[PDB]
Amino acid sequence: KPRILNSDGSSNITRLGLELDDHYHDLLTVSWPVFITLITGLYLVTNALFALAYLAVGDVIENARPGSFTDAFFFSVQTMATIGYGKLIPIGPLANTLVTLEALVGMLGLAVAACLIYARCTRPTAGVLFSSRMVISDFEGKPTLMMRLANLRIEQIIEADVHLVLVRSEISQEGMVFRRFHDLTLTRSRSPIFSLSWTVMHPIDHHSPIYGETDETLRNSHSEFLVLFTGHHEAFAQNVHARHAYSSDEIIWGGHFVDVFTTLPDGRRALDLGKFHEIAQH
Amino acid sequence: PRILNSDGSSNITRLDDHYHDLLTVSWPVFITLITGLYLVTNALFALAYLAVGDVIENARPGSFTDAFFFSVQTMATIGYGKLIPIGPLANTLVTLEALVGMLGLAVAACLIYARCTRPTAGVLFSSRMVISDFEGKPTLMMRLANLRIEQIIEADVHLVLVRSEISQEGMVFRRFHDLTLTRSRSPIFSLSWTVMHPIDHHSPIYGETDETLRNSHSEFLVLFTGHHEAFAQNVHARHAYSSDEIIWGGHFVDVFTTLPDGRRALDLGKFHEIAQHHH
Amino acid sequence: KPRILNSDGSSNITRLGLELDDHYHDLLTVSWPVFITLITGLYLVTNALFALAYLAVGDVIENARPGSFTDAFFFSVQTMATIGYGKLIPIGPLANTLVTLEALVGMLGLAVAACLIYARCTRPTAGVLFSSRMVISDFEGKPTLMMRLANLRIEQIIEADVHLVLVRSEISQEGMVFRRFHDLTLTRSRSPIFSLSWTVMHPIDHHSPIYGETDETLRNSHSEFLVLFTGHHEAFAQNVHARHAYSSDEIIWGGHFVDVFTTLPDGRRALDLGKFHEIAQH
Amino acid sequence: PRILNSDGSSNITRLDDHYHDLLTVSWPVFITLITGLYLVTNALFALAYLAVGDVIENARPGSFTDAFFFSVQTMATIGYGKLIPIGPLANTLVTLEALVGMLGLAVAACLIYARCTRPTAGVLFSSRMVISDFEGKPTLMMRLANLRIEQIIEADVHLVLVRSEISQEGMVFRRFHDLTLTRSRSPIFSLSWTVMHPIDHHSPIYGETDETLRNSHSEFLVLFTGHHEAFAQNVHARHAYSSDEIIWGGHFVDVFTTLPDGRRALDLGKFHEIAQHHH
Ligand SMILES: [K+]
Ligand SMILES: [K+]
Ligand SMILES: [K+]
């Protein structure tokens, strides 16, 4: 039984034409060492280009060796960074018109760097933990499939949403083995304030694709369970999310999630995450 | 005589707002405005020093050229040292010009940032819709795919039927009918997604045919939204179709093939292709 | 009949204790001339304070008249703005330790200014026009209350929401004249793409507080109709909104909104907003 | 033995993450980290010039003090002129130190901005709830008010009943019941808003009394959200109550009085006051 979705929810599927006009997407998605290099490489090339302009207009930099690329590059660097030490200064109106434009490039050039830097950083992780496996035990009468979610950080999550999806290959009346996504109704699909742990539950009633399906049936149909958390974290005043996927083998039947809440020796209620993935039997 | 273009924009010809206009203009036009505003502010500040003292050291007195380039180095905080202010009159404007170039840069980064953090959704739409039997019932279909490795969270498609009809009150107009999709929200959208509208009793296309849709100038509007993982931002895309854009009895070719190694790939070359009859 | 809500939707109601710890709210809400002044005044006071520190540590500025506040202020200004002309320079380690901290103040001080500037600006107006008055005419059988909304800008609005609310004073079983807000169901409460004009409609059926209420009844009960538009504008990639309120007198019965769409002499369909507030009779 | 505090935080004691930690720490601790990181970077760059050439002009050779203050003026782009680099070794680090202080400022503005654009909602909650007859039926009530002139758009209140109960499976736990308010969303919230929960057949408080709620350790959680006009940002507030926080048969005193001139005012001094019996 092949697995289509990874444990992180990513679809393990290649796409043709790996193969820049999507630059803004590329700039935000490349790694930080590559991003620092791109800004570094762009910075030296941009200073190397302005240097030639000072050399092409003639020796218009005092205290600069005529025709020396370094002094023009290091006057550009001192002009681009607005250091303006004082030894190397421009001469006449033409050099200053090249300096007044270079400073304009320095102002706008920094802002685009600040923009790219800012947008790359404000991507806060949700900081929520998923249960290693799913369990199906009776709850309030019906047999209920359930998985757990823990908030690792102290700050609470507002408007917490959970979306449990069963992805499974079925056959239609036409007669094709296509992949179909089923929404699994939950006892609770919205938690106003998510502080600690949230045990998501799917009652298996008349309205459930899992109804009447044994352990062998889920495995032989390549059944997988896609999970999506969404909320508004208080720590960032920003929206955060998390995804995860289970397979038919990762569900254990008759399992009972061990109580995460314990009682400390002192006499205060506490939360032990060491028993978050623990499961009991009945 | 089409009301909606294929991109979603309305065909109807429309017969200060500074903040909107700033982000509206193109990137070259935006770069020009900063330059002009930067030069004029430096030109005005040059006329300031010249029109109240003429204290710019190591510079031709009365020459605006030396004053503009001192104002530049002062607003651009270069401070070479050759051109230096003299007396309280120049030092007062130096303090003000500095306060100008600092607030002036912050507004520059503010406008630049707001213009680039408006990312495209990167979603491809089918060039046509198919009306065929899915599990017996005839269902109107159109599919979309993701053109980026990153996934879109909480993806919502909205399919709207735009057509011209006559009310009981005797006035003809154009109403927008919300089509009921089998799935209105996909929690994780990473590859391709086929959107289906079952044509049942409570369906505005129910009873219609190839001709009746065209005769009423029926048009179909699609709206996709979702939280893109690449940008940590809500992205959206739009598309529209007409009656002549539907191919009855069509089926979208399966875009999921298999590589020689054994890897499952997304064949987006067969995304717009549609075979008729049964397949 | 007194009016509680203004035409802009603002509640015309004073609140006690006009009467800073809510500074962040104050900084964003004060007017721009006041905001520029606050940053200006903070800038001079901050440069005047650093100047005294250079004077209190002793004459440690070359080419500066000893004990002169201006030269210390204008060295601070040249140090705060990082101009560094060259005549006025610090002397010894103590002056430079005061300069290395002043530059740190200049970096952080600019960012807070840039932050306040940015947050004050990214408040885009929705750019949507409301109909001057409401009309109640028959539509699809039932008598339907309706008002119009026009998109002034070219860019379309995504996920456009309209919330029509009837605010009215009623009496409960206890016997109190309180204000009550009624949600008026609409034929359409959501427009995926808002390009041009949107005619909101409230059918007056069995589920409507306006049902069985004449013109005289709405006026004698101080009835008002609060309207809220909400959407995601394409021009800003940001959420925009608008509010508005009508009164019982602003509704005209039997009115028929004149068609906003016309036909140009050329032969193309066009949209004339000159007849947006026009109303016909039947 | 209270599970939720009056602010909404859970009482349960909990038994790198750099980006979260940066915004988490207090404002004084945040200012310190920049200073330390700024000094150490200048100290490292000073050791750079000294450890490869010693070319800082007009400075005591081998003295770290003169090198730190040159590195500062170079990273802080002051460029007085007395201390100037000499040769390619210093000019190369000057170019790099400049690239550092420029990327270093941009991350500084990035972290500062993210920390202040997290505004408080500015919403006051009632210190207690009342269960009284509104239009006959007994309705649980709690009200909130806006402490700012600016209005909140699309305001949503969420009232949740937290209590400990036993399942049919014989295990005792704590379930969260969503209370059904008469109004879950207020489009425009500018003054005061009274939230009511009618106790009907489908109500978890139905049949309960003053004692049964306390005996089951019942607690009430409230969550307010909305789009504040002052910040153009979504603000939220939270609050919680216990069984002992309810006053049965109580009524909130009307907060809308009248001024001598004739103006209608919002009397927030009588916001928490509640009269019993009938009023
Ligand atoms: K500078
Ligand atoms: K400088
Ligand atoms: K200098």
Residue numbers in the entry:
A (entry chain B), C (entry chain B): 11 to 29, 34 to 296
B (entry chain A), D (entry chain A): 12 to 26, 35 to 298
Task: Give excerpts from the publication.
Potassium channels propagate electrical signals, maintain membrane potentials and facilitate numerous downstream cellular processes. KirBac3.1 adopts the canonical fold of a K+ channel, with inner and outer membrane-spanning helices supporting an inclined, shorter, pore helix that supports the signature selectivity filter. All feature an hourglass-like constriction at the intracellular opening, leading to the widespread conclusion that the canonical permeation gate at the helix bundle crossing is closed (or nearly so) in all Kir structures, whether determined by crystallography or single-particle cryo-EM. Thus, data presented here indicate that inward rectifiers (Kir) are able to conduct without requiring the substantial conformational changes predicted by the canonical gating mechanism.
To covalently constrain the dimensions of the hourglass-like constriction, paired cysteine point mutants were introduced into KirBac3.1 upon a cysteine-less background, in which each of the three native cysteine residues were substituted for serine or valine (C262S, C71V, C119V). This allowed us to covalently link the four inner helices into a tetramer without obstructing the conduction pathway. Following purification of A133C-T136C and S129C-F135C, covalent linkages between adjacent subunits were generated, either by direct disulfide formation using Cu2+ as the oxidant or by the crosslinking reagents 1,1-methanediyl bismethanethiosulfonate (MTS-1-MTS), which forms compact linkages (CysS–S–CH2–S–SCys) with slightly more tolerance than direct disulfides (CysS–SCys), and dibromobimane, a rigid bicyclic molecule. To visually inspect the channels for intact crosslinks or unanticipated effects on structure, crystal structures of two of the KirBac3.1 adducts, S129C-F135C-MTS-1-MTS and A133C-T136C-bimane were determined. In both mutants, four crosslinks encircle the conduction pathway at the Tyr132 as anticipated. Both revealed electron density bridging between adjacent inner helices, consistent with the predicted covalent linkages. An overlay of both crosslinked structures onto the native pore is illustrated. The differences in rate (and overall signal) between crosslinked and reduced forms of the pore are not significant, which indicates the enforced constriction is not rate limiting.
